[PDB]
Design a protein around this nucleic acid. Structure first.
Ligand SMILES: Nc1ncnc2c1ncn2[C@@H]1O[C@H](COP(=O)(O)OP(=O)(O)OP(=O)(O)O)[C@@H](O)[C@H]1O
Ligand SMILES: [Fe+3]
Ligand SMILES: [Fe+3]
Length: 899
DNA sequence: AAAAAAAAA
């Protein structure tokens, strides 16, 4: 029949005009086709068409055709009546009162009209294909159940009229994408990825510019050719939409190590053995597990590994996963330059992905690889050709929430690399395994970078990759894929056969790293007052040789109020000198402050301060919480930690003479050997302050302590005794002599790993025929725990007006400085910098209205959920600690927040 | 009682 163009698909923002539903549908079908050819990785396209068991011109045409049917659900009365419309020639199909999403309806009508064209009635293919189109807005719906023999009617689709036009529309786009015949196979994992494709497509033709332009040349009627005109017009315009979005693939030409990295003069022992023995092993899709110490160039190795795996799997896309927004920021630069160096001269962006990437002004817009607008959008990030972000951005592809199959699509065409794997806790590990699981089944090649990593984990990781690859999980009988991990050393995994080639099997060197002097480890007992450590005594003793001959020392404390006491203690102790330098650094400083301290600190004690002689010849001490453990270019002559689990101590203590080998540092006399003094309480099973049992499992401290007393002051070889210490503290049972406390630890780990299984999507086997499991729940974390809120201290005079400074001269912003007083990214960036991150606890449940921000701010994503912390200021101008949610707060200039 | 991450069509 002649398909009437009165049926619309868009009304929003057209200035009273409407866009016909055929036209939106074709547009989508075009965009989906273009995508297929020009955007998707070659190796991806193959994985999909292979899983459909077909050729690609065909595969992309079926995909082209489907994607056009995504909004067919809009052809119901419930949807089209919303705006003014004359449906006098379409009686019947009266309102139900159900209010079905058009998407759902699409998923509902499709499985009983697709066989018209050749699809298996009840065929898993028809099953999957209509389910994934019905989920074209990021929620999947269950396969339609029905009791009669005429479900098209059971589901509402009952008018002969309306049903011809649904068919006309069905038929129109069938004609356009070339009447493609149904594939034989299609499964869940492929179909969710194909979902992402359709979604990206619905988005690209949904923009107002595109639409308003197409709005000037609407075909005059439903004729197969008026429509073939339009389908061809849109076919023509989509590529320029890719270019606006910075979507073109970043393609790097094959090269050696030395060619890729001209600048790097000498390859690393590790690097030489990778660049040599991997080209052969990279037969196709598979996994590389690299593991080695700090500063051993793994990033550079990684960029390379990726490229071999890149050619092997038709995958130029890049995602590099990092443990913090910080380490991501830095690495964004490292890869942007690597791209400028490597790309052939001849508009594809390179993305920064984390919550804060708007507040970076060197990234976000107001150059090739420059971030574009469109790509700045909310879930899009992972759709960029290359991209570097936090690991959380990727695990969000395997939690159960909306658009996780967009997130999957993005990850699919790329090589993916996660650094500092060792970082992840039990909760995140479980999330990762399942990502690795789903990437396994999807032919995406994977790189894992780490420092020393415990074996159980390494096993579990690659095991997950292989369970995904082959399509069946592991047996209790089946012989574990990993039994020992070598530090340093690498490891390759093949998809085709699941062969775990180690380093020791392809080459016997052993891998060369930096040579460095054995670390001293000194258990030092400490007296106890009121449950916590009084350290006054032992501090005067260990840092007396600093106050005399100079030096660089670092004191690490388990908690924040601790390292604040240990700063006061030290601070008074220099007021007596009176004429070393003294620094404090934890998580509780306003962002603005935290940065510059970090800056000063990685200048003095950093590698750039030895090379520039800026390293302080007078004594210098730093007092830190576990902030030290992440991303700090430091080097200290002496270090003194409180006990932690060994894994953390050995990384806390990687800083000591981290740049000794450069021989560009004179160490003080007293600084004989690289030393870690480790505080511990004096006893009366081993016991610890509650504040240590609170952050670390009592059992884990107790083991670590005993694992050290088992050496009696013997030194730790590096990098040779490190892996045996990380494996053993967990593995040995004989280190545990409190069993209640050591069973609590194992229970608490179950707790976390358990919660994570509840967050995650299904194992791909289980999603073989049913996508509905993917987005179904009843906000999900990428991290176990209560989390942090951000607080902003405002100051209040007795009037009391509100100020941003204790000097009460910068009025509190009731408004912004953009047009109409809206807040801006520049405005938020400024504002956010005075906010400080405070761990959720009972206090946040007792928040009065003067802790809840101005109404102007509720309209801003960054500012919306800020908690305001008042700090009263006297008439004589003094900051008093102030009541807020049942605890006294005081932002101190030199110490940070204090509650 | 640590640190760490976290409106679309
Ligand atoms: N041949 C080489 N040997 C040692 N270092 C090198 C070499 N070539 C370059 N470097 C530099 O050494 C540093 C090594 O740090 P890299 O970026 O590899 O991180 P890493 O400490 O090795 O591991 P991670 O990625 O976890 O930080 C880099 O700054 C790199 O510029
Ligand atoms: Fe839709
Ligand atoms: Fe749509």
């Amino acid at each position: 029949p002649p398909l009437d163009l009165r049926f619309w698909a868009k009304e929003r923002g057209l200035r009273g005009k409407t866009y016909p539903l055929v036209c939106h549908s074709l547009d989508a079908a075009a965009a989906a086709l273009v995508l297929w050819n020009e955007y998707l990785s070659p190796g991806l396209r193959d994985t999909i068409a292979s899983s459909m068991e077909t050729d690609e011109e065909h595969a992309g045409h079926c995909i082209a055709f489907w994607a056009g049917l995504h909004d067919i659900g809009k052809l119901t009365r419930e949807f089209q009546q919303q705006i003014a419309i004359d449906l006098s020639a379409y009686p019947g199909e009266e309102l139900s009162g159900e209010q079905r999403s058009h998407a759902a309806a699409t998923g509902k009508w499709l499985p009983f009209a697709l066989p018209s064209l050749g699809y298996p009635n009840g065929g898993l293919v028809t099953g999957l294909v209509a389910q994934m189109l019905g989920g074209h807005h990021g929620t999947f719906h269950p396969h339609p159940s029905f009791q009669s023999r005429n479900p098209l009617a059971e589901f509402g689709f009952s008018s002969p009229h309306w049903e011809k036009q649904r068919h006309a529309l069905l038929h129109a786009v069938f004609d356009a994408t070339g009447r493609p015949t149904p594939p034989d196979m299609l499964d869940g994992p492929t179909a969710s990825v194909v979902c992402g494709l359709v979604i990206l497509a619905d988005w690209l033709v949904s923009q107002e510019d595109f639409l308003l332009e197409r709005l000037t040349s609407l075909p005059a009627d439903g004729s197969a050719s008026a429509l073939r005109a339009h389908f061809e017009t849109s076919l023509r315009r989509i590529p320029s939409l890719l270019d606006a979005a910075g979507l073109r693939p970043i393609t790097v030409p094959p090269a050696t190590f030395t060619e890729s990295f001209p600048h790097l003069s000498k390859p690393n022992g590790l690097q030489a053995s990778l660049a040599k023995h991997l080209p052969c092993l990279c037969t196709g899709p598979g996994l590389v597990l690299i593991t080695a110490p700090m500063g051993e160039g793994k990033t550079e190795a990684a960029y390379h590994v990726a490229d071999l795996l890149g050619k092997a799997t038709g995958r130029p896309g890049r995602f590099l996963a990092l443990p913090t927004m910080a380490t991501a920021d830095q690495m964004h630069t490292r890869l942007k330059e690597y791209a400028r160096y490597r790309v052939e001269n001849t508009s594809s962006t390179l993305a920064l992905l984390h919550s804060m990437a708007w507040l970076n002004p060197d990234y976000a817009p107001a150059d090739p690889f420059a971030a574009t607008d469109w790509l700045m959008g909310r879930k899009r990030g992972l759709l960029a050709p290359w991209a570097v972000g936090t690991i959380d951005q990727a695990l969000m592809a395997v939690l159960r929430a909306k658009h996780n199959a967009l997130r999957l699509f993005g990850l699919a065409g790329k090589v993916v690399v996660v650094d500092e794997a060792h970082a992840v806790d039990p909760y995140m590990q479980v999330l990762l395994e399942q990502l690795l699981r789903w990437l396994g089944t999807l032919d995406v090649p994977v790189v894992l970078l780490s420092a020393t990593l415990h074996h159980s984990i390494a096993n579990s990781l690659v095991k997950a990759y292989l369970e995904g690859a082959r399509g069946r999980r592991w047996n209790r009988s089946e012989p574990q894929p990993v039994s020992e991990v070598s530090y340093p050393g690498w490891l390759h995994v093949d998809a085709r056969i699941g062969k775990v080639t180690r380093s020791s099997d392809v080459d016997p060197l052993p891998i060369a790293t930096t040579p460095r002097k054995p670390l001293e480890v000194r258990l030092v007992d400490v007296p106890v007052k009121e449950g916590a450590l009084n350290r006054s005594t032992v501090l005067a003793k260990e840092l007396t040789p600093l106050v005399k001959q100079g030096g660089c020392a670092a004191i690490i404390c388990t908690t924040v109020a601790e390292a604040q006491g240990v700063y006061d203690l030290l601070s008074q102790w220099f007021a007596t000198l009176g004429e070393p330098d003294l620094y404090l650094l934890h998580s509780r400083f306003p962002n603005r402050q935290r940065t510059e301290i970090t800056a000063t600190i990685v200048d003095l004690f950093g590698k750039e301060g030895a090379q520039s002689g800026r390293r302080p010849t007078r004594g210098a001490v730093l007092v830190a919480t576990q902030v030290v453990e992440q991303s700090l270019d430091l080097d200290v002559d002496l270090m003194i930690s409180d006990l932690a689990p060994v894994s953390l101590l050995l990384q806390r203590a990687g800083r000591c003479w981290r740049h000794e080998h450069l021989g560009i540092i004179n160490r003080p006399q007293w600084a004989k050997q690289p030393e870690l003094v480790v505080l511990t309480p004096e006893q009366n099973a081993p016991w610890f302050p509650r504040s240590w049992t609170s952050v670390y499992p009592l059992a884990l401290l107790q083991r670590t302590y005993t694992l050290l007393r088992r050496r009696n002051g013997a030194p730790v070889q590096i990098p040779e005794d490190v892996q045996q210490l990380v494996d053993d503290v967990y593995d040995d049972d004989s280190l545990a002599e409190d069993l209640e406390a050591d069973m609590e630890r194992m229970g608490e780990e179950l707790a976390q790993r358990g919660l994570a299984r509840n967050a995650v999507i299904p194992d791909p086997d289980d999603a073989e025929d049913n996508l509905n499991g993917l987005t179904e729940f009843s906000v999900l974390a990428t991290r176990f725990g209560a989390g942090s809120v951000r607080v902003l201290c405002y100051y209040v005079d007795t009037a009391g007006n509100r100020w941003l400074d204790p000097e009460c001269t910068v009025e509190f912003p009731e408004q912004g400085t953009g047009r109409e007083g809206r807040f801006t990214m520049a405005d938020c960036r400024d504002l956010v910098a005075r906010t400080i991150p405070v761990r959720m606890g009972p206090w946040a449940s007792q928040l009065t209205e003067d802790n809840h921000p101005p109404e102007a701010w509720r309209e801003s994503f960054y500012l919306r959920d800020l908690v305001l912390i008042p700090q009263r200021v006297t008439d004589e101008g003094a900051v008093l600690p102030t009541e807020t949610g049942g605890r006294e707060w005081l932002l101190d200039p030199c110490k940070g927040l204090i509650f």
